[PDB]
Amino acid sequence: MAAMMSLNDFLSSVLPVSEQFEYLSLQSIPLETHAVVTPNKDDKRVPKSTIKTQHFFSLFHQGKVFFSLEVYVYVTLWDEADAERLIFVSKADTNGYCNTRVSVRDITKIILEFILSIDPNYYLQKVKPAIRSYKKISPELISAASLYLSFTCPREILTKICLFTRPASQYLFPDSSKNSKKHILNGEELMKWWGFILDRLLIECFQNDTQAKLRIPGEDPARVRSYLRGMKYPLWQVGDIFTSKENSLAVYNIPLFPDDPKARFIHQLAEEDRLLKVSLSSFWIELQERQEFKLSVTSSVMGISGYSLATPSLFPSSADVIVPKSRKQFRAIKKYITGEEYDTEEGAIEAFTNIRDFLLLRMATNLQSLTGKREH
Ligand SMILES: CC(=O)SCCNC(=O)CCNC(=O)[C@H](O)C(C)(C)COP(=O)(O)OP(=O)(O)OC[C@H]1O[C@@H](n2cnc3c(N)ncnc32)[C@H](O)[C@@H]1OP(=O)(O)O
Numbered sequence: 001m002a003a004m005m006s007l008n009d010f011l012s013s014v015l016p017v018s019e020q021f022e023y024l025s026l027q028s029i030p031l032e033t034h035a036v037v038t039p040n041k042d043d044k045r046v047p048k049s050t051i052k053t054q055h056f057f058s059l060f061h062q063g064k065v066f067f068s069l070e071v072y073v074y075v076t077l078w079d080e081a082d083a084e085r086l087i088f089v090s091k092a093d094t095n096g097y098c099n100t101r102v103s104v105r106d107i108t109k110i111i112l113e114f115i116l117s118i119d120p121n122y123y124l125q126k127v128k129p130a131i132r133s134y135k136k137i138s139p140e141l142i143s144a145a146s147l148y149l150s151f152t153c154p155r156e157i158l159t160k161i162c163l164f165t166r167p168a169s170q171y172l173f174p175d176s177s178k179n180s181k182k183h184i185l186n187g188e189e190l191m192k193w194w195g196f197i198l199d200r201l202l203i204e205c206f207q208n209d210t211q212a213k214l215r216i217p218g219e220d221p222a223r224v225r226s227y228l229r230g231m232k233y234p235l236w237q238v239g240d241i242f243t244s245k246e247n248s249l250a251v252y253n254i255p256l257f258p259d260d261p262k263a264r265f266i267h268q269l270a271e272e273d274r275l276l277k278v279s280l281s282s283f284w285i286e287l288q289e290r291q292e293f294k295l296s297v298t299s300s301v302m303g304i305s306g307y308s309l310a311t312p313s314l315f316p317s318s319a320d321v322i323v324p325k326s327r328k329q330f331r332a333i334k335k336y337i338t339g340e341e342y343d344t345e346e347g348a349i350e351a352f353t354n355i356r357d358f359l360l361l362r363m364a365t366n367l368q369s370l371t372g373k374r375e376h
Pocket residue numbers: 089090091092093094095102103104105106163164165166167168169170171181182183184185190193
């Protein structure tokens with residue numbers, strides 16, 4: 001954290017010179033959650049705790065939202081000296097209501113790099129417990145006469161990035177594909193768009209001994225390998241970061257993320273009682289063969305696993321992030337973006353005006369403004 005420290009610093013460095021933008025950086029209160037990967041009974045170490053935090057970002061220009069990004073950070077604790085973090089990139093989207101040229105690719109990369117700079121201890125200082133104790137008072141006692149957990153871990157811990165590329169008309173902006181200015185990448189372009197972002201993350205932010213993995217489920221590895229040849233990070237391989245013998249059973253290896261085609265298919269296997277039957281190999285085949293084919297669309301899975309070049313030591317300021325007091329408040333603010341109709345620019349205007357009004361009135365806070373620094 002030497003040149004660029006703030007989320008303001010990071011966004012500004014990739015946004016066009018002298019142009020003005022605003023951002024929403026919204027964050028849930030960290031909470032205890034189920035392990036990312038289902039534990040096996042016959043394993044010698046099960047996580048002490050798994051802590052999950054959502055970062056939701058929205059970028060604005062000229063009083064209109066135009067981009068949003070939803071990311072989940074999981075800190076998995078095995079002991080005091082033994083921990084891992086994983087950044088799951090869940091949904092990125094645009095609505096086409098921006099009248100200036102920006103690189104959404106670079107905005108997306110730079111956001112993840114801000115996130116990579118956060119000390120995992122930031123999420124561990126105040127954590128909502130998975131099980132809360134309550135004493136409930138029966139109304140019978142009224143007459144006519146009347147806790148957060150905390151943890152620590154090392155700053156420099158094993159860092160994972162996971163994402164599933166799959167194009168759609170929209171993920172965060174309903175009916176935005178009705179906007180003729182919205183630019184939708186096809187599956188192949190989108191896989192390349194994310195592979196470019198990850199390649200730069202590896203080169204700018206990770207040590208040279210880092211695992212970098214790409215698979216295209218149900219497809220022969222010969223296609224994957226050819227593409228990887230153009231990467232600048234020297235250690236990309238075909239496959240994933242889940243591999244190895246927790247047994248070959250998919251359920252004890254596949255991570256389970258919100259709204260992810262994985263989890264969705266593990267859940268179908270659960271309903272079919274086949275969790276103790278399907279190997280990782282059959283998994284990737286049936287994922288495509290039985291579930292993902294209906295989308296008629298090129299999809300890929302990408303994983304990174306390794307150590308950051310610089311020790312993450314940022315605790316985001318109130319400028320960097322807004323953490324609502326409440327889960328209801330988090331949800332109401334996010335829904336001003338995600339519950340809007342974007343078939344006209346009026347949806348992009350209304351999202352901005354509702355968000356800024358909510359923040360000002362309920363939380364005495366503004367959207368942050370940015371002046372771009374990148375020349376052409
Ligand atoms: C993990 C996941 O979330 S996967 C799901 C991803 N999200 C979606 O599929 C939802 C729909 N897609 C989108 O919203 C968009 O297509 C995104 C966010 C994926 C990318 O948005 P874009 O604005 O295309 O991104 P960006 O600014 O980086 O430009 C990408 C390329 O498209 C070009 N481009 C951008 N806008 C336009 C346009 N209106 N017309 C023509 N070309 C354009 C750029 O020149 C660039 O070209 P290059 O890659 O050859 O340099």
